[PDB]
Amino acid sequence: SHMQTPETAFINNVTSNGGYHSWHLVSGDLIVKDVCYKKLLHWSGQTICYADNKFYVVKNDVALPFSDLEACRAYLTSRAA
C-alpha cells in the first residue's frame, strides 16, 4: 500500500503494458484464506495473485508459493513456450 514489493516490481513494468507474454493484465483482487491477494495477472489455466510480500500462482485447483524473485520471473517467462 505504501512501498510496492520486489516481486511485483519487475512485473508492474509489464502490468502497465497489458500483462506478461501469455499472462494478461488484470486486477480483480482475489481474497482467500483471509489473505486479500492482488490479481496482478491472469491467464487461462493459472492466476498471478501476490500478497503483502508473497507471490502465488494458483493452478487448475492448487497453490504454488514462490521462493525468490528469480522464481517469480521464471514463472512468467518460463510458464509456456
Curated annotation (Swiss-Prot):
Q: What does this protein do?
A: Responsible for the cleavages located at the N-terminus of the replicase polyprotein. In addition, PL-PRO possesses a deubiquitinating/deISGylating activity and processes both 'Lys-48'- and 'Lys-63'-linked polyubiquitin chains from cellular substrates. Participates together with nsp4 in the assembly of virally-induced cytoplasmic double-membrane vesicles necessary for viral replication. Antagonizes innate immune induction of type I interferon by blocking the phosphorylation, dimerization and subsequent nuclear translocation of host IRF3. Also prevents host NF-kappa-B signaling.
Subcellular compartments: Host membrane; Host cytoplasm
Question: Could you tell me what reaction this enzyme catalyses?
Answer: Thiol-dependent hydrolysis of ester, thioester, amide, peptide and isopeptide bonds formed by the C-terminal Gly of ubiquitin (a 76-residue protein attached to proteins as an intracellular targeting signal)
Q: How does it sit in the membrane?
A: Multi-pass membrane protein
Q: What range of the intact protein is shown?
A: 1445 to 1522 of 7119
Domain DPUP positions: 5-78
**Protein name per its UniProtKB record:** Papain-like proteinase nsp3
